[PDB]
Every structure is written in structure tokens, then in C-alpha cells.
């Protein structure tokens, strides 16, 4: 019965990673946010979630962090957002990396779905025991 919690945590974590990848793709060409700061790319942090003491368990998303990767600089001095040298900070989104993240998250999502289907069938069949 714990397997439902484990696989549901896995599905939630992969959904969060997919949403972060979609957010990174959407704002690859973004210039500014609601304030004057640029869009720093997001990445989720996966951890092992074992509420009891048995070492292993499901995966949990501890936090969403902004990659410390350097900000791309484009020479646009007429933009009011430019600094003293006339450069504007554009995000450092890795397009190929984010597409690969999307596809890999999708595949892991399906694997967890298949696991859930199989174990649900087994737990339905165990109620038949000797009757």
C-alpha cells in the first residue's frame, strides 16, 4: 500500500520537473520580469523521501532553485534596462537540455504510471485470496 504513496510522489515530482522545463522554454527569449531583473532559469531539486528510517523510498522535490549559470549579455544601449556598459541580461536557458528534460520526464512519468497499474492489479487480486 506504500507503493501508491511512492509512485504518486514520483508522478508529482516528474510533473514539477516538466512544468519547470516548460517555464524555461517559454521564457528563453524573455527580457524582464515584473521587476527589472532578468529571468533566471529554474531547476527542481530531487531528493529521496523516506519519512520512516528505512533508507529508501519515493522522490520528493525539495526546492526550486535558479541556476547560478552566468547571464547572457546582449549589447543594447538604447534599452533602459542596460547597465553602465550598455549590456542587457538575457536568460541562460539551454534549449536542447530543456527539450531532453521534457522527453525524459515524460518517459519516467509513464514508467511510474505502468508501475501503478500493475501494483493496483496485484492488490485487487490479493483480495480474492481463497475466495
Amino acid at each position: 500500500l506504500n507503493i501508491f504513496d511512492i509512485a504518486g510522489s514520483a508522478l508529482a515530482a516528474q510533473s514539477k520537473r516538466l512544468n519547470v522545463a516548460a517555464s524555461n522554454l517559454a521564457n528563453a527569449d524573455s527580457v524582464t520580469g515584473p521587476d527589472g531583473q532578468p529571468y533566471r532559469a529554474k531547476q527542481v531539486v530531487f531528493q529521496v523521501d523516506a519519512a520512516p528510517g528505512q533508507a529508501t523510498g519515493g522522490v520528493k522535490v525539495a526546492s526550486v532553485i535558479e541556476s547560478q549559470a552566468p547571464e547572457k549579455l546582449v549589447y543594447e544601449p538604447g534599452n533602459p534596462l542596460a547597465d553602465a556598459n550598455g549590456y542587457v541580461k538575457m536568460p541562460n536557458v539551454d534549449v536542447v537540455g530543456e527539450m531532453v528534460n521534457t522527453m525524459s520526464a515524460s518517459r519516467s512519468y509513464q514508467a511510474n504510471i505502468e508501475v501503478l497499474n500493475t501494483v493496483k492489479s496485484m492488490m485487487l487480486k490479493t483480495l480474492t485470496l481463497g475466495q
Binding site: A21, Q43, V45, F46, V48, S67, A69, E98, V100, S104
Partner: peptide, 16 residues
Amino acid sequence: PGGVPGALSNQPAPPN
């Protein structure tokens, strides 16, 4: 203590 998944942890970076 696992770290960031996917792109950031699958790129060659110098240790710090």
C-alpha cells in the same frame, strides 16, 4: 543528498 536533476547535473563542470 541528491542534487538538481536533468540538465545541470549532466553537464561537465569543474568541481568546487
